[PDB]
Symmetry: C3
Subunit: 46 residues, 3 copies
Amino acid sequence: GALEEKVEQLGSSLDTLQTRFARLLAEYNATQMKMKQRLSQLESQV
Amino acid sequence: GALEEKVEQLGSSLDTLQTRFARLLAEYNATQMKMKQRLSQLESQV
Amino acid sequence: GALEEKVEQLGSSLDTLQTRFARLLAEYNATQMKMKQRLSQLESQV
Protein backbone atom coordinates (compact mmCIF):
# COMPACT_ATOMS: atom_id res chain seq x y z
CA GLY A 1 0.00 0.00 0.00
CA ALA A 2 0.96 3.64 0.56
CA LEU A 3 3.65 2.84 3.10
CA GLU A 4 5.23 0.07 1.12
CA GLU A 5 5.30 2.41 -1.87
CA LYS A 6 7.05 5.19 0.02
CA VAL A 7 9.62 2.84 1.42
CA GLU A 8 10.31 1.64 -2.13
CA GLN A 9 10.64 5.24 -3.27
CA LEU A 10 13.06 6.00 -0.43
CA GLY A 11 15.09 2.92 -1.26
CA SER A 12 15.58 3.95 -4.88
CA SER A 13 16.23 7.61 -3.98
CA LEU A 14 18.93 6.65 -1.48
CA ASP A 15 20.56 4.34 -4.04
CA THR A 16 20.72 7.17 -6.55
CA LEU A 17 22.19 9.56 -3.97
CA GLN A 18 24.81 7.02 -2.89
CA THR A 19 26.06 6.74 -6.47
CA ARG A 20 26.09 10.50 -7.01
CA PHE A 21 27.97 11.01 -3.75
CA ALA A 22 30.58 8.42 -4.74
CA ARG A 23 31.09 10.26 -8.05
CA LEU A 24 31.50 13.66 -6.40
CA LEU A 25 33.93 12.42 -3.76
CA ALA A 26 36.14 10.80 -6.45
CA GLU A 27 36.13 13.81 -8.77
CA TYR A 28 36.74 16.22 -5.89
CA ASN A 29 39.73 14.16 -4.73
CA ALA A 30 41.07 13.99 -8.30
CA THR A 31 40.71 17.65 -9.26
CA GLN A 32 42.07 18.81 -5.92
CA MET A 33 45.42 17.19 -6.78
CA LYS A 34 45.85 19.02 -10.03
CA MET A 35 44.72 22.34 -8.57
CA LYS A 36 47.23 22.19 -5.71
CA GLN A 37 49.92 21.20 -8.23
CA ARG A 38 49.16 24.25 -10.35
CA LEU A 39 49.09 26.65 -7.40
CA SER A 40 52.35 25.27 -6.01
CA GLN A 41 53.96 25.71 -9.42
CA LEU A 42 52.91 29.34 -9.70
CA GLU A 43 54.07 30.10 -6.14
CA SER A 44 57.51 28.65 -6.73
CA GLN A 45 57.63 30.89 -9.77
CA VAL A 46 56.70 34.23 -8.14
CA GLY B 1 1.55 4.85 13.96
CA ALA B 2 5.15 4.07 14.92
CA LEU B 3 6.26 2.76 11.52
CA GLU B 4 4.59 5.53 9.55
CA GLU B 5 6.55 8.00 11.63
CA LYS B 6 9.93 6.30 11.15
CA VAL B 7 9.28 6.36 7.40
CA GLU B 8 8.29 10.05 7.65
CA GLN B 9 11.49 10.89 9.46
CA LEU B 10 13.53 8.86 6.97
CA GLY B 11 11.92 10.70 4.04
CA SER B 12 12.49 14.05 5.61
CA SER B 13 16.16 13.34 6.47
CA LEU B 14 16.77 12.04 2.93
CA ASP B 15 15.07 15.07 1.36
CA THR B 16 17.24 17.39 3.44
CA LEU B 17 20.43 15.57 2.39
CA GLN B 18 19.46 15.50 -1.31
CA THR B 19 18.90 19.22 -1.25
CA ARG B 20 22.23 19.81 0.51
CA PHE B 21 24.06 17.48 -1.87
CA ALA B 22 22.55 19.12 -4.96
CA ARG B 23 23.76 22.53 -3.77
CA LEU B 24 27.30 21.27 -3.02
CA LEU B 25 27.52 19.57 -6.40
CA ALA B 26 26.48 22.75 -8.24
CA GLU B 27 28.92 24.86 -6.20
CA TYR B 28 31.79 22.37 -6.75
CA ASN B 29 31.19 22.42 -10.52
CA ALA B 30 30.92 26.21 -10.54
CA THR B 31 34.06 26.90 -8.50
CA GLN B 32 36.05 24.39 -10.56
CA MET B 33 35.39 26.51 -13.62
CA LYS B 34 36.21 29.84 -11.95
CA MET B 35 39.38 28.50 -10.36
CA LYS B 36 40.66 26.88 -13.53
CA GLN B 37 40.14 30.17 -15.34
CA ARG B 38 41.94 32.14 -12.62
CA LEU B 39 44.80 29.65 -12.90
CA SER B 40 44.99 29.92 -16.69
CA GLN B 41 45.19 33.70 -16.45
CA LEU B 42 48.01 33.48 -13.95
CA GLU B 43 49.92 30.95 -15.92
CA SER B 44 49.94 33.24 -18.94
CA GLN B 45 50.79 36.33 -16.89
CA VAL B 46 53.91 34.63 -15.55
CA GLY C 1 8.33 -7.97 9.28
CA ALA C 2 10.23 -7.39 6.05
CA LEU C 3 8.99 -3.81 5.74
CA GLU C 4 10.14 -2.78 9.20
CA GLU C 5 13.48 -4.39 8.51
CA LYS C 6 13.96 -2.58 5.18
CA VAL C 7 13.10 0.65 6.98
CA GLU C 8 15.78 -0.07 9.60
CA GLN C 9 18.38 -0.89 6.92
CA LEU C 10 17.60 2.35 5.08
CA GLY C 11 17.95 4.35 8.29
CA SER C 12 21.41 2.90 8.96
CA SER C 13 22.57 3.53 5.39
CA LEU C 14 21.29 7.11 5.40
CA ASP C 15 22.96 7.83 8.75
CA THR C 16 26.28 6.56 7.41
CA LEU C 17 25.88 8.76 4.27
CA GLN C 18 24.97 11.76 6.37
CA THR C 19 28.26 11.46 8.22
CA ARG C 20 30.28 10.89 5.05
CA PHE C 21 28.63 13.97 3.50
CA ALA C 22 29.31 16.13 6.56
CA ARG C 23 32.98 15.13 6.28
CA LEU C 24 33.12 15.99 2.58
CA LEU C 25 31.31 19.32 2.91
CA ALA C 26 33.56 20.43 5.77
CA GLU C 27 36.77 19.70 3.94
CA TYR C 28 35.44 21.19 0.71
CA ASN C 29 34.65 24.46 2.50
CA ALA C 30 38.04 24.56 4.29
CA THR C 31 40.08 23.81 1.17
CA GLN C 32 38.05 26.35 -0.81
CA MET C 33 38.99 29.12 1.63
CA LYS C 34 42.64 28.21 1.35
CA MET C 35 42.63 27.89 -2.41
CA LYS C 36 40.94 31.25 -2.78
CA GLN C 37 43.46 32.92 -0.50
CA ARG C 38 46.37 31.37 -2.42
CA LEU C 39 44.92 32.58 -5.72
CA SER C 40 44.37 36.07 -4.37
CA GLN C 41 47.95 36.23 -3.01
CA LEU C 42 49.26 35.16 -6.42
CA GLU C 43 47.12 37.73 -8.23
CA SER C 44 48.34 40.44 -5.84
CA GLN C 45 51.91 39.47 -6.63
CA VAL C 46 51.13 39.14 -10.40
